[PDB]
Structures are given as C-alpha cells and as structure tokens.
C-alpha cells in the first residue's frame, strides 16, 4: 500500500525535479527526495584550538569555519545513522529534533 | 522470473521467429 | 628516550567491541594545563599516572 | 490525382540505387528545383542555374548561394555573427 502521503519526497506541482548525486555513493536521486543536511564546522576540531591560538601570529583571530551542504540518498542516510526507521505514528513528525 | 526480462526474452523469441519465417517467406 | 607522564583526571567510558579499552582524559604531570584523550588497556581509576610513550596523539573511537 | 505514395520526384529512378539513397536525393532535389523568394524584388522567381548560382527571373539578379538551397544555415549564422561583430567594433 501507500506508505507516505508525500510519496517520500516533496513534489506537489512539478512533475520533474533535476537530480543530484549522493555524496557517499554517487547515486542519482531527485533533489526533493534527498536527505539534505548542513555540515557547518570549525576547521580545528576543537582540540587543537588552544595550540593554534597560542601559535598564531595574531591575537583576536576569527578561526573561520567550513560549510558544506551534504546530500544523502535514502540507503546511505539510513546506513550512516543520519535518519533511522520510525514508527508508523511518528513517521508523520515533520519538525526537526 | 522478472517481467522485464520475460518481456526481453519473448522479444528475442519474436525476432528469431520473424527471421525463421522470413527464411521461407 | 623521552616519555611523558600524564595524570588521568576523568574516565569517560569503555571502548572497543569487547569493552577492553577505556577512553580517559589525562592532564600532563609536567607541562601542566595540557589535556589529551587516550585509550587504556587495563583497569584504570582517576588520579592514576600513565606513561605516554608519545604525547602527540588523540584517539576518537575503536569500532 | 496523387500518382505516387512516397517516391515523389525520385520516381524517375525506378527501383534502382536503393531507397535510402533515393530519400537523400529526393530531399535535395526538391530543394534545388524549388522556387524561392527574391530578397530584392520580393517575388517567387529565384531558380537555380548551376550549383551555387541562384538567379531571379524577374529582376535578373544573381546570388551566390548553396549548391541545392539559396542559403545555407552556416551562411546565415556567419552573416549574423559578422553583423554582430560589425556592430561591436564601434562599441
């Protein structure tokens, strides 16, 4: 039967959405169906921050961040514990944790 | 068996039958 | 032959598949105010003194 | 009435030379024997004299064109980019 009212994607009024590639396996997946996350992270991984702050030529340094928009297919998103299988009731939960 | 490959197999069969009938015709 | 003594101040938890490895956070005895995270094989408490054969390393997990 | 179904002008070739070659010469012979609009006198009087020579019966002008059409697409786009570069050389 029909599992999801949205068919597992976000396509109401298009007919076609150009696909992207999974960042883990290069599977072609429509852009609306993917499991888009946003990895915003400091570059120093929070353990060398003191060493770089004391080894910097400048005080007051910003220590910038790296930003990536990660696109996952369903299989890789499930296998990498990004999303997991939810109950039939809490499948409808739309809000992020 | 899967319906797509059943369709492919009977299409190859139809092609082979076409050629063995065109042998006489 | 340099080795670095480090006093464990906080035990985190067991690691590895079979639980025979413990994450610890050690504070260096000399050159204090320096903290690092290591893996320990045997039974460890806090306030123990480890002898790191090399200090320039930090572990994450053991799958 | 319609005498032939699909061979058209290539009915003069009969059964010879193959259908896939007769199709190409059909598509090209229609073009080289068609009449075209004269860009000077405005009439449908341009006819091919020889390969590349297209002359108007009314105004007696003679244009150099394609071998089977009065103007090829390559010549059209070359005229367009030449016009654009001429418009660009002042600006």
């Amino acid at each position: 039967p029909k599992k999801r009212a949205s068919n597992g994607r976000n396509k109401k009024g298009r007919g076609h959405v150009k696909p992207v590639r999974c960042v883990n396996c290069s599977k072609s997946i429509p852009k609306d169906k993917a499991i888009k996350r946003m990895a915003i992270r400091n570059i120093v991984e929070a353990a060398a921050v003191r060493d770089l702050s004391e080894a910097s030529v400048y005080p007051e340094y910003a220590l910038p961040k790296t930003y990536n928009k990660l696109h996952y297919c369903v299989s890789c998103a499930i296998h990498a514990r990004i999303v997991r299988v939810r109950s039939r009731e809490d499948r409808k939960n739309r809000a992020p944790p | 068996m899967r319906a797509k490959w059943r369709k492919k197999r009977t299409r190859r069969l139809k092609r082979k039958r076409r050629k063995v009938r065109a042998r006489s015709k | 032959t340099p080795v670095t003594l480090a006093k464990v101040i906080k035990v985190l938890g067991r690691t590895g598949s079979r639980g025979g490895v413990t994450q610890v956070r050690v504070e260096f005895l000399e050159d204090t105010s320096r903290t690092i995270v290591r893996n320990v094989k045997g039974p460890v408490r806090e306030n123990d003194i480890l002898v790191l054969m090399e200090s320039e390393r930090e572990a994450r997990r053991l799958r | 009435a319609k005498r032939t179904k699909k061979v058209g002008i290539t009915g003069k070739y009969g059964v010879r030379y193959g259908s896939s070659l007769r199709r190409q010469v059909k598509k090209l012979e229609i073009q080289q024997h068609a009449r075209y609009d004269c860009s000077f006198c405005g009439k449908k009087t341009v006819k091919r004299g020889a390969a590349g020579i297209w002359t108007c019966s009314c105004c007696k002008k003679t244009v150099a064109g394609g071998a089977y059409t009065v103007s090829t697409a390559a010549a059209a786009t070359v005229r367009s980019t030449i016009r654009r570069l001429r418009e660009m050389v002042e600006a």
Binding site: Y58, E60, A62, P64, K65, T66, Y67 | - | - | -
Partner: protein, 226 residues
C-alpha cells in the same frame, strides 16, 4: 607504501636551498603597508637571469595584513610582479577576491541571492571583470520568514548595480579603483540607489579580475613605489 615502488626510473646530489636567494616583495602605494613577505628563486646565473623567472609571479595576500586592521580579513589581493630593482622587487594589482568562509557565511537560505557582473574597461586601459553580490533581508517588523524578491526587482537591482559599477570604474584608473574598493564606498552607493527597491543587505563587491593589461609603462609603475 615506502617500499612498494617497483621501479624508481623507467631507464635504469646537492641541497638546492644553498643554491637559492631571498627576495623582498613590495606592495604599491595604495596600502599603508608595503613589505608583504619574501620569495625565493635560484641564483641569477648567466643562462637564466632569475629576474625574468621571478617576473611573472602572482602572490596572494590578505587585505587585513595589507591594511593593518582586521575588518578586511575576508578580502584577498593578488599582486603580480612586474619589476625587480635590487632585492626589493615591486608588485602591482592583479585581482581582488573574497574568502570561501565569508562567501559561505553570506549565502544562507530563505533569502534571495543577487549576483551581477560587468566586463568593463577603465581609464588607464585595463579590462576588468567586476563581480557584485547582494542578499535580501528581513525588514524590522517583518513576520514572514523568507523575504524573497520578485525577480523584476532583481532585474532592476542588477541593472542599477551594473551601471553604477561601470560609471564608478570609468574615469577612474586602477589605483583609484583600489582606493575605492578598500573603504567600500561602492557598497554604500549601491544600497543608496537600491533602498527604494528592496532593503537588500550584504552589498559586498566580489572578485575583480584582470583580463587584459596595457603595456608595462615603468614610469606609471614607479609612480606608486616612491
């Protein structure tokens, strides 16, 4: 990995840093600082004449370190070497650009990104391709959560951005353009012209790239480095 080389050579010793010399690189006069580092080439032998090998070098340096302050920390300046006179070789402007972290922090969603670019020639015969970026912003008191533009506002904004860029670069030389780009007056002129179209935050001018330089004109280059 250290021993897996099956053959080192298809067929079958001196340190090269004793062979090299240092060289101090100078920025043009449109900067409060000049000494932006040092560079290395081999010794100027009779067959190489190391000045020519060192001529075509492009060195990137941050505008914060060029201007002392830290508010220019997200802008980079490429300086192309053009002349060498005795160990304190002088450079010239080759292109501005932002950093990836700044651009990535600027671009967020539920707002509209507006880019424009012009390919315009300046007074002293340089051909510069200037890029400008802008972002829609929520007004104060706005309760709807995206604040997108309506794609004709975008076209008008891009038109006025392009004509302002051409007007500000024409009649200006290259050094005049750098002394315009440093204090960021183009951004305030753009927001002054576009405030009657959209609120329109983040009016940064992105990279500018040289496409065609005129001939060298060492007098005009030495007019900077005094």
């Amino acid at each position: 990995a250290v021993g897996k080389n099956k053959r080192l050579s298809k067929g079958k010793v001196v340190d090269p840093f004793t062979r090299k010399e240092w060289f101090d690189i100078k920025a043009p006069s449109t900067f409060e600082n000049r000494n932006v580092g040092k560079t290395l080439v081999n010794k100027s032998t009779g067959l190489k004449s190391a000045s020519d090998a060192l001529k075509g070098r492009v060195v990137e340096v941050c505008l914060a370190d060029l201007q002392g302050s830290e508010d220019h920390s997200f802008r980079k300046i490429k300086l192309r070497v053009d002349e060498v006179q005795g160990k304190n070789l002088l450079t010239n402007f080759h292109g501005m650009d932002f950093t990836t972290d700044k651009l990535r922090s600027m671009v967020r969603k539920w707002q509209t990104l507006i880019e424009a670019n012009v390919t315009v020639k300046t007074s002293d015969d340089y051909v510069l391709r200037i890029f400008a970026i802008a972002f829609t912003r929520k007004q104060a008191n706005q309760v709807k959560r995206h604040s997108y533009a309506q794609s004709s506002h975008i076209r008008a904004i891009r038109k006025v951005i392009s004509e302002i860029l051409t007007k500000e670069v024409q009649g200006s030389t290259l050094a005049q353009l750098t002394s315009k780009l440093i204090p960021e007056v183009i951004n305030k002129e753009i927001e002054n012209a576009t405030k009657d179209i959209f609120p329109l935050q983040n009016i940064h001018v992105r990279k500018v790239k040289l496409l065609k330089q005129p001939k060298f004109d060492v007098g005009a280059l030495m007019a900077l480095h005094g």
